[PDB]
């Protein structure tokens, strides 16, 4: 059927603090998200024969393990159980994938968010933003931020989101070459897990930092190298659990100038921060 095109932007954690750990191992976080005007593009063609096909498998991820497919299947389940899924609802999905796996840019969660929002719209299920954010939290920690579509402060177990208006700066984002899946960092015994809970105003007045950065820097020489390079030019930090690091600039020209200083083995891009997700249109 029709071929629809849907943005899946990256995010940055402008700061990220680990305030505690539950007995089941889950870490409570206080973190501030901003989107980038940069990321993946999904093409979604709806179907009436009930089939769900990923036309562009992502290397390193079996099909049924792709968050694209998991998101579609979860929406189908939730909508069907509430009598909101038309019979034969299906989709063919392809992705122009720019965001790396294990990058800390939230590519997987962003893909899931876009698929939830796009298929809910196309199939006409009528699920609210609240309902899609509740589904999204089951798929990925940051799916709710992408679903709701606003730069936001996230606490609780990731479901408490408050809109914030951080400066829409220009960022140089580097991929230091290695992939660091979040569990590799969150299982580290030396990870900080006792940063004090702070109000949003207090956090906005703190020195922005990422509690994962010291661990990633020490465990991965590639992250240390990328951070050492960018820090010669601008405030620079890890995003997510890495491996990606970013540097902040006041202008596009300055960011692209510093990107030009990048060693050839350090892939990077320049993108502006945006507080409204392209997905929200």
**Known binding-site residue numbers:** 100-110
Within 172-211, the residues that bind ligand ANP by CB under 6 A are 181-182
List, comma-separated, the residues after which the chain is broken, a break being a C to N distance over 2.5 A; otherwise answer none: none
DSSP 1-70: ---EEEEEEEEEEEEEEEEEE-TTSPEEEEEEEEEEEEEEEEEEEEESS--EEESS--TTS-GGGSHHHH
- Residue of 11, 40, 169, 211 marked catalytic: 11
Within 36-65, the residues that bind ligand ANP by CB under 6 A are 58, 61, 65
Among 72, 74, 164, 180, the residue binding a second copy under the rule CB under 8 A is 74
Q: Which does 137 bind (CB under 5 to 8 A by kind): a second copy, ligand ANP, none?
A: a second copy
Task: Give the residue from 183, 197, 176, 174 showing the smallest Cα distance to 270.
Answer: 174
CB–CB of 12/118 below 8 Å? no
Q: Which does 111 bind (CB under 5 to 8 A by kind): a second copy, ligand ANP, none?
A: ligand ANP
Residue found under tokens 């007995």: 23
- Residue of 40, 97, 142, 211 marked catalytic: 142
Give the count of beta carbons closer than 10 Å to the beta carbon of residue 173. Answer: 25
Among 108, 242, 273, 278, the residue binding a second copy under the rule CB under 8 A is 108
Q: CB of 19: closest distance to a second copy in angstroms?
A: 8
Among 24, 49, 81, 165, the residue binding ligand ANP under the rule CB under 6 A is 24
Q: Give the binding site for a second copy (CB under 8 A).
A: 19-20, 22-26, 28, 67, 70, 74, 77, 81, 108-109, 134, 137-141, 156-160, 181-183, 186-187, 197, 199
Q: Give the binding site for ligand ANP (CB under 6 A).
A: 23-24, 58, 61, 65-68, 101-109, 111, 140, 142, 181-182, 240-241
């Amino acid at each position: 059927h029709m071929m629809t095109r849907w943005p899946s932007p990256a995010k940055l954690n402008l700061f990220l603090y680990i305030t505690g750990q539950r007995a089941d191992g889950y870490h409570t976080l206080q973190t501030l998200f901003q989107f980038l005007d940069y990321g993946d593009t999904l093409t979604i063609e709806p179907r009436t024969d009930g089939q769900l096909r990923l036309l562009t498998p992502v290397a390193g991820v079996p099909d049924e393990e792709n968050l694209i497919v998991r998101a579609a299947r979860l929406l189908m389940h939730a909508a069907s159980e509430s009598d909101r899924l038309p019979a034969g609802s299906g989709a063919d999905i392809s992705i122009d994938k720019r965001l790396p796996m294990g990058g800390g840019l939230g590519g997987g969660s962003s893909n899931a968010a876009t698929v939830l929002v796009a298929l809910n719209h196309l199939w006409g299920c009528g699920l609210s933003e609240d309902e899609l954010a509740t589904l999204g939290l089951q798929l990925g920690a940051d799916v709710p931020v992408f679903v709701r579509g606003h730069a936001a402060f996230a606490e609780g177990v990731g479901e408490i989101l408050t809109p914030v208006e951080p400066e829409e700066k220009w960022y140089l984002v580097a991929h230091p070459g290695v992939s660091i899946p979040t569990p590799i960092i969150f299982r580290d015994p030396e990870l900080p897990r006792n940063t004090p809970r702070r109000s949003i105003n207090t956090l906005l007045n703190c020195e922005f930092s990422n509690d994962c950065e010291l661990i990633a820097r020490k465990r991965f020489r590639e992250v240390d190298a990328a951070l050492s390079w960018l820090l010669e030019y601008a405030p620079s930090r890890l995003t997510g659990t890495g491996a990606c690091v970013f540097a902040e600039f006041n202008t596009e020209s300055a960011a692209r100038q510093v990107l030009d200083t990048a060693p050839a083995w350090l892939n990077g891009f320049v993108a502006r921060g945006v507080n409204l997700s392209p997905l929200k249109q």
